[PDB]
Amino acid sequence: PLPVSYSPGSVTSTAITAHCDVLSECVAKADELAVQLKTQEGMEEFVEELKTSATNEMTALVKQMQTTPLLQRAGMHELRRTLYYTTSLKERDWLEEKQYTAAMRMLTVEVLRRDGDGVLSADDVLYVTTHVVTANFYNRHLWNRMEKSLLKFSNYENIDMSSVKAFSTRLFKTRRGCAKETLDIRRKVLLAMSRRVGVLANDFDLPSLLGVLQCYTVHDLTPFHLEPLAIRATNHVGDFTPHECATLAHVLRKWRTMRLEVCERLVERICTSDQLTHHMANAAMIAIRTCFNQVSDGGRNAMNAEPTRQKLRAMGEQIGCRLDEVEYPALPVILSILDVVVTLKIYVPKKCLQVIFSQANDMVAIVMEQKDDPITAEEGRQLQALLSHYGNDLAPELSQRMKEAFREGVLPDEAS
Amino acid sequence: ARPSALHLIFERCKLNLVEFTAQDVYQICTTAYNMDTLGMLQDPDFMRGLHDAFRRSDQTVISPFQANLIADTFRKVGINSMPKEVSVPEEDAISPESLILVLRNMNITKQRDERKINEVLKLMFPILDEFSPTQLSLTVTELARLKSTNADFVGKLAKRIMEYNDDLSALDISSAAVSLAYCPGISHNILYRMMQIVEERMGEFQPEDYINVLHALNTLGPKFVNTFRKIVECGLQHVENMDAVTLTNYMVCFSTMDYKQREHIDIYADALVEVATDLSEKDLVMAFIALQRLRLLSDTMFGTMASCVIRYAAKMDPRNIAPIMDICSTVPHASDHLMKVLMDRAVECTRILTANQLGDILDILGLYPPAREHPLVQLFGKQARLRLDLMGPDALANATRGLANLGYADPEYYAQAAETGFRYGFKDWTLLEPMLMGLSITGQCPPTMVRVLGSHIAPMARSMSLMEIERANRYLRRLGCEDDFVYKAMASRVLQFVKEVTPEMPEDLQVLLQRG
Amino acid sequence: VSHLSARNIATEALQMKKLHQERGGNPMLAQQARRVLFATSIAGQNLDARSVALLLNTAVYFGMESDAKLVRECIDYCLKNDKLITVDVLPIVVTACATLKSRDAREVIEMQAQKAARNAKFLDAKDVTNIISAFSKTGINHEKLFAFLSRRVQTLARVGEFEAAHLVILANAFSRLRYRDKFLFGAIARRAMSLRERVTVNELVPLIVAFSKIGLKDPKLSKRFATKAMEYVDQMNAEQVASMFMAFAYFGIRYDQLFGVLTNRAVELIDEFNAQYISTTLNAFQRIGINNPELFDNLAERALAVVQDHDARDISKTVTALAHFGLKDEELFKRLASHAASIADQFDAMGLVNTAHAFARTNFLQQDMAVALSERSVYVCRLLDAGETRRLLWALAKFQVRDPKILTPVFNRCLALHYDFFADPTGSEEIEEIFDFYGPNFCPPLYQLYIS
Amino acid sequence: SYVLKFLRGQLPEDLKDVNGALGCLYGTLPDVDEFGQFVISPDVVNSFHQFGYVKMPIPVLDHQQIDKLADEVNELANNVEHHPKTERLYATSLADLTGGPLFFCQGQWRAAWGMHDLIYLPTITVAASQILNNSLVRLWYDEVFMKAARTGPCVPWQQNYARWQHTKPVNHVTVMIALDTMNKDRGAPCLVPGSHRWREGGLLPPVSYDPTKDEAHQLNTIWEIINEEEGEMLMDTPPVTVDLRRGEALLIHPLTLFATHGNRSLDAVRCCFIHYMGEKTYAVQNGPLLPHTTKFQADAMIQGPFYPVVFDPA
RNA sequence: UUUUUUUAAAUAAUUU
RNA sequence: UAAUAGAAUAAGAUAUAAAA
Numbered sequence A: 001p002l003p004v005s006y007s008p009g010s011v012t013s014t015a016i017t018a019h020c021d022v023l024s025e026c027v028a029k030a031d032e033l034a035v036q037l038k039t040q041e042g043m044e045e046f047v048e049e050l051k052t053s054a055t056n057e058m059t060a061l062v063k064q065m066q067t068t069p070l071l072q073r074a075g076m077h078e079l080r081r082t083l084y085y086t087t088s089l090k091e092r093d094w095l096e097e098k099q100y101t102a103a104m105r106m107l108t109v110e111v112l113r114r115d116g117d118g119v120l121s122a123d124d125v126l127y128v129t130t131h132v133v134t135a136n137f138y139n140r141h142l143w144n145r146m147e148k149s150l151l152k153f154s155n156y157e158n159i160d161m162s163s164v165k166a167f168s169t170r171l172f173k174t175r176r177g178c179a180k181e182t183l184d185i186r187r188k189v190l191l192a193m194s195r196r197v198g199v200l201a202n203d204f205d206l207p208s209l210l211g212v213l214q215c216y217t218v219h220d221l222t223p224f225h226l227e228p229l230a231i232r233a234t235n236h237v238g239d240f241t242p243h244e245c246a247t248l249a250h251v252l253r254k255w256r257t258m259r260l261e262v263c264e265r266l267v268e269r270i271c272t273s274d275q276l277t278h279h280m281a282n283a284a285m286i287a288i289r290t291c292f293n294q295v296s297d298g299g300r301n302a303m304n305a306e307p308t309r310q311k312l313r314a315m316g317e318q319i320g321c322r323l324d325e326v327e328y329p330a331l332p333v334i335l336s337i338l339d340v341v342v343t344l345k346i347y348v349p350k351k352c353l354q355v356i357f358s359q360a361n362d363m364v365a366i367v368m369e370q371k372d373d374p375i376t377a378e379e380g381r382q383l384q385a386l387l388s389h390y391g392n393d394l395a396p397e398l399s400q401r402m403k404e405a406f407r408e409g410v411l412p413d414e415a416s
Numbered sequence B: 001a002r003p004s005a006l007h008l009i010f011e012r013c014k015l016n017l018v019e020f021t022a023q024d025v026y027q028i029c030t031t032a033y034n035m036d037t038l039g040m041l042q043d044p045d046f047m048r049g050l051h052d053a054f055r056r057s058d059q060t061v062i063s064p065f066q067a068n069l070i071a072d073t074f075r076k077v078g079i080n081s082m083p084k085e086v087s088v089p090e091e092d093a094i095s096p097e098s099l100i101l102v103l104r105n106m107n108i109t110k111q112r113d114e115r116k117i118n119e120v121l122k123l124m125f126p127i128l129d130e131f132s133p134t135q136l137s138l139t140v141t142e143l144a145r146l147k148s149t150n151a152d153f154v155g156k157l158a159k160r161i162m163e164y165n166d167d168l169s170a171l172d173i174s175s176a177a178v179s180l181a182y183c184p185g186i187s188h189n190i191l192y193r194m195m196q197i198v199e200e201r202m203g204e205f206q207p208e209d210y211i212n213v214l215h216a217l218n219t220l221g222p223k224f225v226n227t228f229r230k231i232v233e234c235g236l237q238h239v240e241n242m243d244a245v246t247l248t249n250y251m252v253c254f255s256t257m258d259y260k261q262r263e264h265i266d267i268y269a270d271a272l273v274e275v276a277t278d279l280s281e282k283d284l285v286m287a288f289i290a291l292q293r294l295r296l297l298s299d300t301m302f303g304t305m306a307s308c309v310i311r312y313a314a315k316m317d318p319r320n321i322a323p324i325m326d327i328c329s330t331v332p333h334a335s336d337h338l339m340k341v342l343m344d345r346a347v348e349c350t351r352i353l354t355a356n357q358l359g360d361i362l363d364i365l366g367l368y369p370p371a372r373e374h375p376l377v378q379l380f381g382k383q384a385r386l387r388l389d390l391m392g393p394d395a396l397a398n399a400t401r402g403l404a405n406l407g408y409a410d411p412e413y414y415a416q417a418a419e420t421g422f423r424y425g426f427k428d429w430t431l432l433e434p435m436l437m438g439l440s441i442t443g444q445c446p447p448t449m450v451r452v453l454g455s456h457i458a459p460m461a462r463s464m465s466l467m468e469i470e471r472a473n474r475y476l477r478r479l480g481c482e483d484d485f486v487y488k489a490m491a492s493r494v495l496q497f498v499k500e501v502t503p504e505m506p507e508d509l510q511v512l513l514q515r516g
Numbered sequence C: 001v002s003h004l005s006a007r008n009i010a011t012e013a014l015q016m017k018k019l020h021q022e023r024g025g026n027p028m029l030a031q032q033a034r035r036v037l038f039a040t041s042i043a044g045q046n047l048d049a050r051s052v053a054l055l056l057n058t059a060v061y062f063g064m065e066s067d068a069k070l071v072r073e074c075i076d077y078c079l080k081n082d083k084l085i086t087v088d089v090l091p092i093v094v095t096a097c098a099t100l101k102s103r104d105a106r107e108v109i110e111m112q113a114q115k116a117a118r119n120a121k122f123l124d125a126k127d128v129t130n131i132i133s134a135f136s137k138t139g140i141n142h143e144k145l146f147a148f149l150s151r152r153v154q155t156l157a158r159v160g161e162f163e164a165a166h167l168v169i170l171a172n173a174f175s176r177l178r179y180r181d182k183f184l185f186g187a188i189a190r191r192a193m194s195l196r197e198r199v200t201v202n203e204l205v206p207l208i209v210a211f212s213k214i215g216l217k218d219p220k221l222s223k224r225f226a227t228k229a230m231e232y233v234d235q236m237n238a239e240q241v242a243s244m245f246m247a248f249a250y251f252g253i254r255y256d257q258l259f260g261v262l263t264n265r266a267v268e269l270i271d272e273f274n275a276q277y278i279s280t281t282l283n284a285f286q287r288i289g290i291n292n293p294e295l296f297d298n299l300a301e302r303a304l305a306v307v308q309d310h311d312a313r314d315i316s317k318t319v320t321a322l323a324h325f326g327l328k329d330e331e332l333f334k335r336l337a338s339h340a341a342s343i344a345d346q347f348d349a350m351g352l353v354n355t356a357h358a359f360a361r362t363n364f365l366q367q368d369m370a371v372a373l374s375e376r377s378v379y380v381c382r383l384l385d386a387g388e389t390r391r392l393l394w395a396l397a398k399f400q401v402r403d404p405k406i407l408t409p410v411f412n413r414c415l416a417l418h419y420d421f422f423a424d425p426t427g428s429e430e431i432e433e434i435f436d437f438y439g440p441n442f443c444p445p446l447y448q449l450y451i452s
Numbered sequence D: 001s002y003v004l005k006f007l008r009g010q011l012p013e014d015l016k017d018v019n020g021a022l023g024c025l026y027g028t029l030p031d032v033d034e035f036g037q038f039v040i041s042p043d044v045v046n047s048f049h050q051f052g053y054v055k056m057p058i059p060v061l062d063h064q065q066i067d068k069l070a071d072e073v074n075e076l077a078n079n080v081e082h083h084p085k086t087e088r089l090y091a092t093s094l095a096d097l098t099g100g101p102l103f104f105c106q107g108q109w110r111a112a113w114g115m116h117d118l119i120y121l122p123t124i125t126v127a128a129s130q131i132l133n134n135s136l137v138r139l140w141y142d143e144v145f146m147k148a149a150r151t152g153p154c155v156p157w158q159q160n161y162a163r164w165q166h167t168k169p170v171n172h173v174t175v176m177i178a179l180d181t182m183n184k185d186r187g188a189p190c191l192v193p194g195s196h197r198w199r200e201g202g203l204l205p206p207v208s209y210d211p212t213k214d215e216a217h218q219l220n221t222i223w224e225i226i227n228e229e230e231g232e233m234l235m236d237t238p239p240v241t242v243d244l245r246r247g248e249a250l251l252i253h254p255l256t257l258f259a260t261h262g263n264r265s266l267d268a269v270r271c272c273f274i275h276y277m278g279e280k281t282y283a284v285q286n287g288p289l290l291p292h293t294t295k296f297q298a299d300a301m302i303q304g305p306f307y308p309v310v311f312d313p314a
Numbered sequence E: 001u002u003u004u005u006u007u008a009a010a011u012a013a014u015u016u
Numbered sequence F: 001u002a003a004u005a006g007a008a009u010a011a012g013a014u015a016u017a018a019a020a
Helices: A015-037 A040-067 A077-091 A097-117 A122-133 A140-149 A161-173 A180-190 A194-202 A206-218 A224-235 A242-254 A260-271 A278-292 A302-321 A331-344 A350-370 A377-390 A396-408 B004-014 B022-034 B044-055 B064-077 B096-108 B114-124 B133-145 B151-162 B170-182 B188-199 B207-220 B222-237 B244-257 B262-278 B281-293 B299-315 B318-328 B336-348 B355-364 B375-390 B393-405 B411-423 B433-442 B447-460 B466-479 B484-498 B507-514 C006-020 C027-037 C049-061 C069-080 C090-099 C103-118 C125-137 C143-158 C164-176 C182-198 C205-214 C219-230 C238-251 C256-268 C275-288 C293-304 C312-324 C330-342 C349-361 C367-379 C386-398 C404-416 C418-422 C425-437 C444-451 D042-051 D063-075 D115-119 D122-131 D215-224 D228-236
Strands: D053-055 D102-106 D137-147 D172-178 D189-191 D249-252 D258-260 D269-277 D309-311
Touching (some): A015 A040, A015 A077, A040 A077, A040 A097, A077 A097, A077 A122, A097 A140, A122 A140, A122 A161, A140 A180, A161 A180, A161 A206, A206 A242, A224 A242, A242 A260, A260 A278, A260 A302, A278 A302, A278 A331, A331 A350, A331 A377, A350 A396, A377 A396, B004 B044, B022 B044, B022 B064, B044 B064, B044 D063, B096 B114, B096 B133, B133 B170, B151 B170, B170 B188, B170 B207, B188 B222, B207 B222, B207 B244, B222 B244, B222 B262, B244 B262, B244 B281, B262 B281, B262 B299, B281 B318, B318 B336, B318 B355, B336 B375, B355 B393, B375 B393, B375 B411, B375 C006, B393 B411, B393 B433, B411 B433, B411 B447, B433 B447, B447 B466, B447 B484, B447 C182, B466 B484, B466 B507, B484 B507, C006 C027, C006 C049, C049 C069, C049 C090, C069 C090, C069 C103, C090 C103, C090 C125, C103 C125, C103 C143, C125 C164, C143 C164, C143 C182, C164 C205, C205 C219, C205 C238, C219 C238, C219 C256, C238 C256, C238 C275, C275 C293, C275 C312, C312 C330, C330 C349, C330 C367, C349 C367, C349 C386, C367 C386, C367 C404, C386 C404, C386 C425, C404 C418, C404 C444, C418 C444, D063 D269, D115 D137, D115 D269, D122 D137, D122 D172, D122 D249, D122 D269, D122 D309, D137 D309, D189 D249
Antiparallel strands (some): D053 D249, D102 D137, D137 D269, D172 D249, D172 D269, D189 D258
């Protein structure tokens, strides 16, 4: 019989199973305490004792993996969970740098040896890549081999549902602080499984249909194979919460799918919210502009161009009337909303205008006074011109303060 | 010859067996650079060991220039060395002095880092008040040397510097003025106020202050011409005794400002050419250029300047051959000797001239009568054929026009030039005429080439004048184009500017009229 | 060479690269440039961004890897001074870092990608083509940058600001990235149609090749390309004839009036055919499906005199094409088998499997090639698909190979991909052949999976 | 085939396929009739054949070349950004991705420029051919040793021919070149005169290697493998340590006892070995002599791309 | 013959 | 003890995929 060494990715159980189970129990207890908060010194004492136990367990495991030939004899799923726990306990700040590197180097060596043997299945490649790039652990040969093997699109065909969702969520959550070098390989994961997700279009939950879409759009990826995923969402509006509708509008705009008929339903669902915020109002205004830009005055339906325009303006005013409940975090939000309303000639009541200008007054005053904390000069010019167009009686303080800001020179330039 | 104790110390230093601090290596390098009695620079196995000692020591003890000097004295021998980069201070190491030292280290040792500049600036802002007046000027100078784009912080620093106008001296005022003028994005209000402050305290200025102010005004531009006025009035009483570099800067500012009061220009030029013999190569070149641009090269002017420049004509820099070559043109004065020496120098350095410089030289010598009977035409033809891959449209047009005007005959070169010009289309008629001129020397070209040439020239016939129409027709007939759309396009323009045919009309035009 | 500063060294390195990649590969210029660039350092001298980028590009082009000093110093400079790398020297840096695969190279490529994404609206005719080609050299998947660049290309091409060379570069750059956009390629085709006579044959063939490779499935432009190419046949070279053969096999539509003239011109220049041209023509004929014995005999005869010129790819393609059509040439097959035995270490992952299967399908067994390919299979087992692994295993079973050191890797690979291994119907017969030889004793788990 | 326009000038994936020598260190190899300049004096040959070792009178490399070679050795052990073409190496101390106080590399002539060029260096290959009775000489393999500062270990007594038992005849020589100045306090080579002719050209039993012990015992383990007569010859001629400059070379017999000291200076120490082998050399077993190399059968002559012929007396 | 866009978006789930 | 700057420039095949 041939000495094959193929172990299932998800029998041949060693002490690694027991060590990982102990780590699982400690992590579960710590998370249970963290949830039980919602006696801080007491819970931090218990966290200290649990992290001491976890550190002792991982020290014993790394000593065993160094001294005796355990990695070759162990299966493959144990390797997967060992990689998971080594890469996860570092983010929780329970491991030191030296021990973390010592474990990861030998895990990488074993994975490289098994790749050389050819046992690495079509799912283990995705798992290892996802759980290595997000930790930003660098090894030249491992990264190059994984990137080269992720271009065999034929292998990645029958991935399970849970594997798809877990990889997508793991890539999605840790996107802010990723180093630049990690970005590109990230994309090569999402497109490896793009066809499977595209075929999997009719099985995703309505909430997930948004998670996958966002995970793809944040990594500036809009593959063709994912086209039905969006279309179903357009046909399933009304099951989304109002806050989700703004994100849906942005996504549909970025997939070249946003049209008038879906825009009407999105605006309607936006207006059904109890109380609006900056996000939904800004998204609604952007959608109204991008749908108003799409009418041709000399096309096939040119004679129908003007009424449609009117309709858009009407559905703008519904949003425009309720513009005082929101709280603007930054000036560009106010400036975008006002540019949209002015250019498209939506009528807005004076009360919301006064609220908008009074809100902007505090921000410009803080910028002027503190001077220690980034309102550019062109944005300030635009705000001044908008206030002048709508009349300076709305906010007399803002005009004088704003002119004085121009006179002194607190506001920097765009070049700087 | 190394005696026993000297040899043993040499061996101990050779084996990296002695721990050396930065101070000791600096002292040894200073001794070596000062005196060469023991042959320190002549033992590679000794300076290699000293370099290994330097790498593994703490270089933060010594000043930045001491580290730069050790690096330079190791580079001179043949060892590639670079002092270590300084880390940004963290936590309580924060202080104005360390934040200035970071910039100074990056300045002297030539290790520019935009990320470290941005980090340092983001941490010096809160304590800007604690800074002393001299530290503000030092920071302004350092940021001006590093070509930082953060003009907002430089403006803030400049405002805080102006607030202490009384404390600062003339040298500090001039340094602040020039360092502000060098920053590109500085707001014009702060610039106006700084030039206003420079406008007063005018009598206190020294020659270094004059040089700094003139440099700043040359950098700024015509918009501050008024201030420059008070400068030329101020120096009207010292003009009979000034440094040659100062008068050269005056001429540069006169040319840049487009000054129009001619009496000051004439007086200053007359004072300059008295002591022009003291100028360096670069300053001599710029005095010549500025005098040319102001229309002041009379006979004695040109004679004196050429006599002064013929000294450096033997070893001219490649970047300085073309400007004086241009100045020798457009003037009705005899410059045969300067031309001959410059052509010889150009021949000497024919393997280091870039594509643009070669094109410029060939263009300038294109119409020169004595330049046809010289080896330069053949040498430059071979060089241009080699360099056709590195030539842009302007360089291609310049070189091809210069070679065609010089009588250089080489069909392969002109065919290759036509192909390279077909790679990127000809935007203008002046960029396309040299190709036709070159191809018409031989008189034959492959039919595909002439077809593409006709396709290119056809749209451009709508705006060219009558002389251009005649020249294009002559070139096309020489090449032998059969395409009718071209001839038709050339015909129409001719009519618009000339109504209908007449017996008086030139025969060629009348033929052009027949759309052959 | 000592009196030359770094700027002159950069200029001369660019000159040497331009002379070598265009006018011949003289093994003298390459070695002189290697020797000169092996003893240069950007240390202690102030240099512009363009000169450093030129030095990095000309060093990397001549074989210098990411371990060399010059490369390390240039990469460090490109990392530290990022705003000095304007949109003029971005393509040089990206092209240089394309083949280097390390941490710093990845970071630099990502930073330049974001910079070109932000300034995609202010580029002109030269910059769009240069940047898109440079980003096509490296393998990157920044879709948003591609969309912005395509939009700018359309806006520029509406007014007519592209030449024939620009069109070829843009078409190849956008086809290499697998960016399927119908409007952009329509605009490029319309710009070429407006150019009319300014596109010659040398600037026409790559256009058709790229337009076929992208695979737009638009039969309106394929016919126009065929009609335009029909007039230019008499001027074509042999390499161009093979290129249009491959291109119009890629298109997939049958144009008999064009194929006949192409065949006549190919027969006319039979003495100028190398092995590469013959392999390309036979692969194109295999793909399109037409069976033309008259040209096939001449191609096989000309392939017999250039046996020593055959590469691994050419041998693989020629043997597979000959085996598909059922052509028997015992001398050519024997010589190709011997040559493949000589260069067995040049086969890639899939070329080896294709060659072995093509040789095994016809009844031609030779120990010289069999042993070499079986031994070489160990280093390419790990880069195989399920169907390719099945084909390799069947070919190996036909060669009667029983060495466990050879059979363990392929059995491991086929066990790791068992689902796709047993879900391909077209190979089902092959499966029943394979276990007819080895039997249930060899790898029992695979047998248990087979029974289910 | 068709090589892309931006990949025309590249080198093969491994430098083994490169026929000849690149011009990196000393330019191009001299002509056929220009190989007589690098001949060595007969007295050096006699000294080698008598002592079992000898030092070349002239340094074989200029100081710039030694600097470049030291840079290559430094880059071969990066341990953060691993060396490209690391998979082209017979063995490495960084296979565990951790390294240590001693870095040893083999078969690096297929990995970096200059190291490949050093093999075809005329001054050493002509001398080695003269030692090998004027025959074609083929590279056996290279080796690089790098010892860290203040903690570098020492390799105890060994015989080179003890590692080459798979090769049938005794026809070899070793050339060792110093990439840094060496002395008894940093990795100096210590050899026993007249030891290559002790056991009738036989191999002494291997020494016992016990790490984590002082250098004195490691170098004193010699009294355990020798017999009484070898002890007397040792007493008459105790082992001699040889000082080497930044470029000096040393020829060693395959059968002479050989050791290197520890490193107690303040910087790492580097040295390089290259083993050269004669034409009339056969194998003993069936299979590859080195990992992933062409396999031989029975008593087959040793050739191929993996053992290139570096010099030919014709 | 022509049809393209401008958010800080953060709610998937698991023992891998 | 140590501080002076100039140039504007384009090469081109990796063995895949459904609708005005």
